[PDB]
Structure 1
Amino acid sequence: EEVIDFSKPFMSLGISIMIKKPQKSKPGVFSFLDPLAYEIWMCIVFAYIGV
């Protein structure tokens, strides 16, 4: 701008983050526990013990 003259921006932008699209993750061993949180499983174990 010190040596030329600009116009008002015709397109405003900024820095941003590019990532690879999340894919269907390869199922993990012990993915059969995913429907319930770990805390539920531990409470189940200790309720079994207590009962």
Structure 2
Amino acid sequence: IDHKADLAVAPLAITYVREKVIDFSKPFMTLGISILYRKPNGTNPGVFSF
């Protein structure tokens, strides 16, 4: 906003508030919110696993 730079090549996510002030190009990468979880292990099937 202060013209101390020319581009902003970075993980700068396009949102409502930033678009109202500065201008973005079209997205070079799209994404979202996802879930981390520990990969299953199978070292405990229960004691009546037979």
Global fold match (TM > 0.5): yes
Q: CA RMSD in A?
A: 1.1
* Greater fraction of residues in helix: 1
Aligned partners of 2:33 and 2:45: how far apart in 1?
A: 34
TM-score normalised to the size of structure 2?
A: 0.55
The structure with the largest alpha-carbon Rg is: 1
Aligned partners of 2:34 and 2:24: how far apart in 1?
A: 24
Counterpart for residue 7 of structure 1: 25
Show structure 1 runs of 5+ residues with no match. Answer: 33-51
Show structure 2 runs of 5+ residues with no match. Answer: 1-18
TM-score normalised to the size of structure 1?
A: 0.54
Aligned length: 32
Higher relative contact order (CA 8 A, sep 6+): 2
Runs of 4+ off more than 2 Å = none
